[PDB]
């Protein structure tokens with residue numbers, strides 16, 4: 001009913017990290033790659049730096065959330081830099097986001113990886129529920145790939161923190177990943193995130209397809225109320241597709257809880273091809289951020 005948030009917000013000097021290349025702009029703003037070298041700490045840490053005015057209130061809300069999480073399947077904030085622009089520094093995920101990764105390696109992704117990814121995404125999502133945190137923007141584009149065997153959830157710009165059912169007021173929302181009760185009444189729950197988890201899994205099983213492609217977002221409310229959902233992907237058995245359909249039920253409380261999605265996909269992961277049918281199944285002192293722990 002209280003629980004003080006004793007997370008540490010580290011302030012990083014601009015002379016500590018060396019930007020190396022621009023990763024790309026769009027949606028938000030500039031995202032860099034670089035190395036972060038703490039002064040006299042004999043380490044070099046590959047990092048990603050974000051920036052884009054008084055939008056600083058929005059970027060600092062994301063820094064508040066990113067610094068308040070600690071889970072192997074959720075990207076944590078390493079620190080911020082308060083130079084002429086406000087920078088967000090996090091661990092570099094070298095293989096990009098999962099959406100672009102699954103699109104580029106279509107013909108070389110096995111069932112074991114697809115099922116392992118859903119287990120890990122469900123693990124990070126169940127952790128966010130333990131922190132009473134509603135992501136509100138779960139998608140394949142917001143899942144980054146550290147290694148092909150290790151993914152993490154990112155982008156907390158819309159993440160809201162509950163206590164002991166959030167009502168939104170802002171503008172741009174991703175309609176095609178949102179639960180029905182969020183499109184109509186702007187209600188967001190941990191079960192609202194489960195709906196987005198189902199759409200996220202559907203993205204992976206279709207190897208990067210766009211949900212409701214060619215359908216205007218204004219008609220999504222009409223379609224889902226009539227009982228229509230996303231189609232069964234070709235590679236998915238009815239066992240896998242039944243789980244997707246369960247996350248899209250009207251009653252918010254049937255959508256499996258994230259702890260149950262961990263279990264179901266775990267058991268499918270120990271026999272992957274029974275449930276997915278796929279055709280043909282100075283770099284010296286560099287430390288990964290996951291092995292750099294500060295008290």
Ligand SMILES: *CCC(=O)Nc1ccc(OC)c(Nc2cc(-c3[nH]c(CCCO)nc3-c3ccc(F)cc3)ccn2)c1
Nearest residue numbers: 023048049050088089090091092093094096097100141142
């Ligand atoms: C699919 C979009 C994408 O992010 N692609 C991508 C291409 C190349 C990369 O490195 C080789 C990475 N690594 C990475 C990215 C991010 C990051 N991505 C975004 C855009 C959201 C996509 O919808 N925002 C960030 C970011 C950066 C710094 C922060 F403090 C917080 C968030 C982070 C880490 N590694 C990705």
